[PDB]
Design a protein around this ligand. Structure first.
Ligand SMILES: CC(C)S(=O)(=O)NC[C@H](C)c1ccc(-c2ccc([C@@H](C)CNS(=O)(=O)C(C)C)cc2)cc1
Ligand SMILES: N[C@@H](Cn1cc(F)c(=O)[nH]c1=O)C(=O)O
Ligand SMILES: N[C@@H](Cn1cc(F)c(=O)[nH]c1=O)C(=O)O
Ligand SMILES: N[C@@H](Cn1cc(F)c(=O)[nH]c1=O)C(=O)O
Lengths: 85, 146, 153, 46, 85, 51, 51, 51, 51
């Protein structure tokens, strides 16, 4: 019933990061894929946008092979942007 | 621990006594002046910065930057060409050149996708469709005839 | 009825036909993917066209699009300009409305956002373009800057 | 994971590792225990 | 710059409560008003919906005269519903 | 009026026109990029059509 | 009428595959060589029975 | 609405349209008149006759 | 209205006409629909005869 954008955000970042740990060393190439996994698991307000767009972009624009931990730790506090459009 | 933030006089009341890095990079966007892609505004002489330009590529630049989350600076290409490699000097000219030699971080413009460029640079999936076409003067309406 | 209906028939000059006639001159941009197309093309018709433009005098090539169109207007319809689709549609939708797009297109391609190889911006910009595509943003932008305010009928 | 207090269990742990995608492993053990663990690794093809 | 739904939520609840402590004994009647102040201050994705709708409703359905503190403390953890529609 | 109807021959041009009438039924493939487009699309006309 | 959206087909590869870049370049050359157009013609209009 | 919120007036009798934005900051009585946004254009003249 | 006043139900969602007689015993939300007393007759025979 109740859906919260905040809880959806936390779940989003967490599921992305938890996904990226399966692909370790290849992470930079799998960021988008794992993001869609988080979007589809935690649900989204807009199917197109995903659970947190800003996070996806920040990560995809930062994550390097075996750089995961610091990348996620720096990207999870970022603003999700607009969940609608 | 405790520290003095100021003092109180019999008159002056409350008097407060005594008491840079980590920033995001500006992305340089190279574009060419072609209508209706990038055009100067009517009053652009009185305006400065990215408020000078208006067009499809301008709006697309704004959107792309907003999605990717970077501060962008629109800059027209120096030589005024799209891109090419001189068969002699093997040197790239135009926007493609400014990408290869790192004069610009990204290129948003009517840059036609060609294999020759695709080898030296990265092209996003096409944001617009086109093809070589023929232009002639609009014919006279003439007459119905006998 | 038939007078009430009107409309018009679309004139088509094609391309090969343009290759076969010496009456109407034609050319392209001074430096561009279009010119490079004609040059580098191993196809018969286009090869012929390129040979013609290459040895045609005075030079049928133009420095800019505006210059080319302006040359089309003052040529009494005796000069054709080979330019990219988009530019042609745009000039066609703006006054004096003396130009026109004739026949089909010679090739099918697209524009794109270019980044230096290995740039961080590459994938996010790509996904951004994909999203703008599905959201109709690209189409709406095209309309805004082409057909929406268009000046000919 | 303490491997000194313990065959099937090894297959289990390596199974969850395969699913979690953790390839990297550090064996801190006696020479004998190392040999054993490696043998168990080869048998189940990890 | 980029606006975050989560940060906007926190700001929403906080600004609402900070407004409601201005009015005392009538709080239950001014809850909606204070919500529009939070919406207009912290901003919203949809002007109609506001910064956090679920919070506003939870409060309107709870707040009693001089019941403010406990009402707010129980309503700020509720799900925002949805900022879009 | 008959030979006038002859040029009245083309009632449906765009998609929007088809969206507004329930007379002519319409649909897409059961599983494909097309259907998924209609679903995931928040665009007005397509939204109506998908609904 | 026209088309509801503007898109394209493409050669798909699994993420991080080596074939991604070469296949891409290959499609580009086939495009510039006119192979793609001629192929569509071969399988569409050339044998076209409606004229 | 301003004179209501800041207490310059005890009540407002006027063609004050009910809007949710106002309903949150003030109290509105049940509607005493119905309306909606409508279009006004200059009436086409029956004029311009003749031979 | 009875089920509301005597507390058989917590709320009433229905085509309940707002009336002064009820407003005293119950609370009415802003009206969610407009209507009025109208006349219903059988559909007269189609088209028309005449010179
Ligand atoms: C998926 C979308 C982002 S999109 O389809 O890529 N772009 C949207 C935009 C309206 C658009 C749509 C379609 C096309 C387009 C253009 C040409 C082709 C074929 C004929 C050649 N492909 S190519 O990439 O240009 C070539 C140089 C190899 C295929 C598709 C170009 C741009
Ligand atoms: N955009 C092209 C350059 N370009 C531009 C035109 F307007 C044109 O008519 N022909 C052309 O090659 C490129 O990127 O090479
Ligand atoms: N009555 C409206 C104001 N108001 C008045 C008009 F005559 C009109 O045409 N439009 C309008 O918004 C309100 O209550 O704000
Ligand atoms: N809605 C009315 C009752 N009610 C219902 C009808 F269907 C009708 O035709 N007339 C009427 O008075 C009420 O609220 O009492």
């Amino acid at each position: 019933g109740p859906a919260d954008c905040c809880r959806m955000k936390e779940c989003c970042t967490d599921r992305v990061n938890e996904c990226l740990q399966r692909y370790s060393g290849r992470e930079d190439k799998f960021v988008s894929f794992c993001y869609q996994e988080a979007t589809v698991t935690c649900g989204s307000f807009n199917e197109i946008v995903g659970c947190c767009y800003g996070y996806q972009m920040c990560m995809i624009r930062v994550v390097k092979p075996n750089s995961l931990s610091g990348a996620h730790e720096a990207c999870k506090t970022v603003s999700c942007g607009n969940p609608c459009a | 621990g405790p520290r003095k933030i100021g003092y109180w006089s019999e008159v002056d009341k409350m008097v407060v006594t005594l008491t840079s890095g980590l920033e995001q990079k500006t992305v340089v966007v190279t574009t060419i002046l072609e209508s209706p892609y990038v055009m100067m505004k009517k009053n652009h002489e009185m305006l400065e910065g990215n408020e000078r330009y208006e067009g499809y590529c301008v709006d697309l630049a704004a959107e792309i930057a907003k999605h990717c989350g970077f501060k962008y600076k629109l800059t027209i290409v120096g030589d005024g060409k799209y891109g090419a490699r001189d068969a002699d000097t093997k040197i790239w000219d135009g926007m493609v050149g400014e990408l290869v030699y790192g004069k610009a971080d990204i290129a948003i413009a009517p840059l036609t996708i060609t294999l020759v460029r695709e080898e030296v640079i990265d092209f996003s999936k096409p944001f617009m469709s086109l093809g070589i076409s023929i232009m002639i003067k609009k014919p006279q309406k003439s007459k119905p005839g006998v | 009825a038939f007078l009430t209906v009107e409309r018009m028939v679309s004139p088509i000059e094609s391309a090969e036909d343009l290759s076969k006639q010496t009456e109407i001159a034609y050319g392209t941009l001074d430096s561009g993917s279009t010119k490079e197309f004609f040059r580098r093309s191993k196809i018969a018709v286009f090869d012929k066209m390129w040979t013609y433009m290459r040895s045609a005098e005075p030079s049928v090539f133009v420095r800019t699009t505006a210059e080319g169109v302006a040359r089309v207007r003052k040529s009494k319809g005796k000069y054709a300009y080979l330019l990219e689709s988009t530019m042609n549609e745009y000039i066609e939708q703006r006054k004096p409305c003396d130009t026109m797009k004739v026949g089909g297109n010679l090739d099918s391609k697209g524009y794109g956002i270019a980044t230096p190889k290995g740039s961080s911006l590459g994938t996010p910009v790509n996904l951004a373009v994909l999203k703008l595509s599905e959201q109709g943003v690209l189409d709406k932008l095209k309309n805004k800057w082409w057909y929406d305010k268009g000046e000919c009928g | 994971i303490n491997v000194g207090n313990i065959d099937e269990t090894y297959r289990s742990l390596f199974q969850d590792l395969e699913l979690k995608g953790e390839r990297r492993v550090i064996l801190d053990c006696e020479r004998d225990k190392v040999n054993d663990i490696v043998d168990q690794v080869i048998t189940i093809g990890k």
